[model samples]
Target chain A: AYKLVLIRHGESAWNLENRFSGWYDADLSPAGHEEAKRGGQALRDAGYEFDICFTSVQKRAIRTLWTVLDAIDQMWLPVVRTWRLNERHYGGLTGLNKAETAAKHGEAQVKIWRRSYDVPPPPMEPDHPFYSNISKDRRYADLTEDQLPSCESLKDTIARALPFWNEEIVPQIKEGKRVLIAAHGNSLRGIVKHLEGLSEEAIMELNLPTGIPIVYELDKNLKPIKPMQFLGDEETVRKA
Target chain B: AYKLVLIRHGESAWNLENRFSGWYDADLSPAGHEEAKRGGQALRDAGYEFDICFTSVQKRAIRTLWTVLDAIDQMWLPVVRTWRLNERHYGGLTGLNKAETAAKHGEAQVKIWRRSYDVPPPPMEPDHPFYSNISKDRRYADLTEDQLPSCESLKDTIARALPFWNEEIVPQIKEGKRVLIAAHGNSLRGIVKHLEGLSEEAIMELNLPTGIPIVYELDKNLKPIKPMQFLGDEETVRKAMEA
Candidate 1:
């Protein structure tokens, strides 16, 4: 059997500002840093040792994992990065505030964008800076045009994620490494759904809160023998 | 040839006190810490990147190497420790002040004990408090009789060190690792004589000032193509060594 721990990234600057972050690359706020630190400390306190860590190329998710490794004195551990581990891209709705978006597009429309399994938000304009200009980023230098997701729904996010698991994660587990994944909420949800074989509607209901660690014990075939959720601070989540 | 760098351990408490510190395990002094930090910074500033490192099991050498590794942010690199890398055992004369030893035994005898290639000082008694036991050492938990060192001359040091060089260091270099040896003076000298084919008398004249690195560029056959010294602040070295 194998052990896997999936972690959602800590809160971000846009998260504090009540913005719909999407693929926005803003760093974690000070509170978010503290949250990540605590999350890492909690894992260390629980005595977890990972053989390999996986992170999104996005800085927020990467930084959260960095804090966790630093807290555990395992910063020297190898890290594998992939765009398949990034958050569900919100497209045109990337930078809007959640409440204001509901006020403008109505609560029902906002709900569909947030919770719809197949309905994607409107696509970004080709001229929008990130849509055509991510090549300047040293982090994404290896990303091919098809690999970069410009817009994605919940199902689309899973499509991007599952292939990586089959090609990378499963083979590593077969090689005998206890794996840990630190990524965005929706990305982790996609992974959880794939690993657990959850139905589409069931995955849509899964809301992974910030800095929470979800542990799964798996069999030799990468089948989860048991799954457990360790949520982040409830009071903090409620306020956020 | 395989390129290698040999570095003597930094100044220690006993080094500052002008005492015989072999196998006594005195830690680096504050100034010694500065010297090691400078040594590491010099390597970094000179764009040296090492893939693997070797160090003596002694705390002074280990700590000095730690300082260097911390400077280069390479503390994560693998460390291979060996008792053969430790300083030439001074035995009964281990902790005596050099000036005091000279006062009693004469400067010539003291120098002979220090610089002679084959003349090792009298062996430390097994009952001596420092040599009493190694039951608590985790580092030696797996060692057999052939790998342990009691007392060492330059000859004995080379004998113990060369087998490891052929088995471990050569393979690592072949696998393409830039290697660093963080060790004591005579242990390094033993390696130098082995590699450079220096005579025993010639090795007697080769003094390595502490914390300075000596880089040797090697050809495919592991012979030195060029040898250079990396000195960290000439005035500081002179002042520290002489003071």
Candidate 2:
């Protein structure tokens, strides 16, 4: 049996303000920091150990993982950070309040933009009013012109994310190394969708709470033996 | 050509209080935090880029490197941390103020203990009145029996530190990768002694100011092409060395 764990980062500043963060980097709020510690405590109490860990280049995810590792006394674990694990690109919707945008764009249209698999929000212009040009981001400098994104639908996210799962993550799991991933909500959802073979409709309904550890037990062939379990109070996790 | 940068971490709480730190894990003082940012700013302004980095596992060194990397916008560099890069173990004198230690033991005796290359201070027994045992430190759990030390002479530090340089650092240099090391005063001194072929007397006389970047230009053979240059004010570097 192989164990894999995934965690959405704690509540970020944008999360509290109900904003569309997308690729904009936001550090964790105070509550988010506590949630990360609680997640680590849960893992430690359950006597879980990991051989390696993964996170996105985003500060929120990285800092969440840092606090978790500190709590579990596993700060020495090899950390692999990649752009593939970054949150979904919000594009033009980036940094806008959700309720306000919904009111402005109409709930029906906003719902489609949020839940539709293939429909991306409007692409941010080169001189997008919200943020500067993508070229200014040093983290994505190595990405080719085509690899960089101005906007991405949920379908696009999965397309970009699954390659990482198949190439980087699957081989590690095959080696029987316990892997822990600390990433954004959509990134974790994307991986979960792939692993559990969820339908696009089912994935749209799936919600991942911040700082909760979801563990999947897989067989030698790496198929999950059962439904993934969340490592926290079920009611609290569901509400979150 | 390969460039290697070595920096002592900013001031620590113990450093501010004039105490013996030596692997006790004191955090950076407020002034030390500023020093770290300034050091990073200097590196960024000088257009120094590193492919890899190294530091002691101690929080002061690790955090200092983190600040520097953050400033340079290269927080993604591969970091290699080891206990071999820790400050020289101050043994039984771990936490006492230097002036108080001098008052307790004669000034001459304390001076000899502080400066002698071969003379280690009194070893910390498990029952010693100072800090806790090394065995309890999770970070050093992987170290072998002899690799763990309750006290270490400067010579002992050089002995332990040289192996890491030879095995880990030298190979990276040979690959022509730019390397940055953020470490303790004595640890950096040990490396400088090795690279510059300084005699024991010369090494003992050396003093490294906190948070100053010492840059070395090395040939393909890894020998320094010129004397190491300090990144900040030349007069400041000279003043630090004198004290």
Candidate 3:
């Protein structure tokens, strides 16, 4: 049996302010630090041991992993930081705070932009400052324009995420070591949909609470033999 | 020229309590941590760089080196830990308060035991708990049964210390990288006497204040070609020795 653990990053400074964070770099707040530590303690309490950890290049996910590792005395663990694990690219919507965006675009248009499976936001032009450094990054440099994901809808995110699972995560799980992935909100949702075979319509209703661990068990052929389940307070979820 | 810097460890828990520490393992006080950090910061500020650091296995010396390394951002530097660099073994005199020892043994006897160059105090018995572990330790494991001192006089310390100089330190210096040795009060004195060629009688007057760095410049033959001097605030030394 192969156990894969995926964690969304804890609440960021932008997350607290209801911003459309997307690929914008935001640091963990003090409470986010506490939440990540609580997640680490929960993992320890559950007796989970990992052989390798994967994190995004973003500071929020990387810092979350760092704090979690510190709690578990596993700071010395081997890690791979990759751009494929970053959140969906919001393009023109990347840095805009949610309230401001809703006021400008109106709520219905904003909801359609956010919830649509195939309705991508405006593409980030090649001349943007973020594109220059991001294009040169070691992990993502070689991709063509289509592969580089300028803007992502939920459909686009799933398309981008599945290749990484088939090429990287599956091969490693076959070797019999536990793997942990720390990543962003939407990108993880893309992964969850793939593992659970959820419909595009079903995925629109799925909201992963920040800083929760979701576990999936795979068989020898790397199919999820068991359903993916969230590991956390059920009573809190029921109340919400 | 060959240059050497010798520093005694900063204040330990035993030092604060005015006890005879010897091989007793004790950590540094917060003040001691500050002193060690300042010592490293002073070296870094003046643009001194060390290729490697040497410390005794005792926790006080190791902890002192840790703080110094943190100050200079060289925590990963290779370290050589030596038993010969330990404080002069206090034997039966270990762990008693200085004033209590003075009152119990009388001031004259305590003075002789502490200050005499050749006369060691009574040896710690073989059955003492510390006796078994020392002989098996990596730093002292190579010693033949008799070379492990139960109680060490300054002369005895020099006799043991000089062999390590010839066998270990001399080659490292000859290889042309600067070495920084963080050690104890008496052991540094033992190295100083040997390196500087101090007469046994004259050596008794030399006192090393804690956390002070003393540097010596040496020629190609490893003999001191220039005078040895201390680095840091000139006034700090007078106050340091008092504490």
Top candidate, metric TM-score: 2
Candidates ranked by DockQ, best first? Answer: 2, 1, 3
Worst 10 residues of 1 chain B by lDDT: B132-141
DockQ of 2: 0.25
lDDT per residue (tens digit) for residues A1-240 in model 2: 999999989899998999988888777899999999999888888889887788887878888887887777676566788888989898888888999999998999999979888899988777776556343576776799877778889888888888998999999999888999999878888888888889999988988877888889998877889998877666765665
The better candidate by DockQ, 1 or 2, is: 2
* lDDT by residue for model 1 (B76-147), tens: 355677776777767766776789989998889878877788887867666655564332244354568655
Model 1: number of clashes? Answer: 4
Judge candidate 2 at residue B167 and give its lDDT. Answer: 97
lDDT of 1: 0.76
TM-score, chain B only, every model? 0.88, 0.95, 0.91
lDDT digits (tens) for residues A90-118 of candidate 1 = 88777778889999999999999789999
lDDT of 1 at B164: 77
Q: List the residue pairs that clash in candidate 2.
A: none
Clash pairs detected, candidate 1: B1-B218, B1-B219, B1-B220, B1-B222
> Model 1, chain A: how large is the TM-score?
0.90
TM-score of each: 0.54, 0.79, 0.53
